[PDB]
């Protein structure tokens, strides 16, 4: 499935099994534009987070209960949700995924 492939392909599960990860199916510039959208606070309290005005296409990758290195196993859940990212640097671009509503 998509998650098993993309997670290994992107060097996420080549040396370990990551329990969960999210992929955004939007253009790079459209996702970077989120850094100047709705400011909100991050889970950790810091307020350099921003929520997208609109929902975006995303795939949630989740490890099953039987997954175990070196044979990671994921469940694929596709959805459209608002993404929350933390930004920093100059240009002000995303550096962390904080959640999706």
């Amino acid at each position: 499935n998509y998650c098993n492939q993309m997670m290994k392909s992107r060097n996420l599960t080549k040396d370990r099994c990551k329990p969960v990860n999210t992929f955004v199916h939007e253009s790079l510039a459209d996702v970077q534009a989120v850094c100047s959208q709705k400011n909100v606070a991050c889970k950790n309290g810091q307020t350099n987070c921003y929520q997208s005005y609109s929902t975006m296409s995303i795939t949630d990758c989740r490890e099953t209960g039987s997954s175990k290195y070196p044979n990671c196993a994921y469940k694929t859940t596709q959805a459209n949700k608002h993404i929350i990212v933390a930004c920093e640097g100059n240009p002000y671009v995303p550096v962390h995924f904080d959640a999706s509503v």
């Binding site: 992107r10 996420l12 990860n21 992929f23 955004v24 253009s27 790079l28 671009v93 995303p94 550096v95």
Partner: peptide, 15 residues
């Protein structure tokens, strides 16, 4: 080697 903006992209972006 890899900056944090690059890592976010490789880990979460699939355009």
């Amino acid at each position: 080697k890899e900056t944090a903006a690059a890592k976010f992209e490789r880990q979460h972006l699939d355009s």
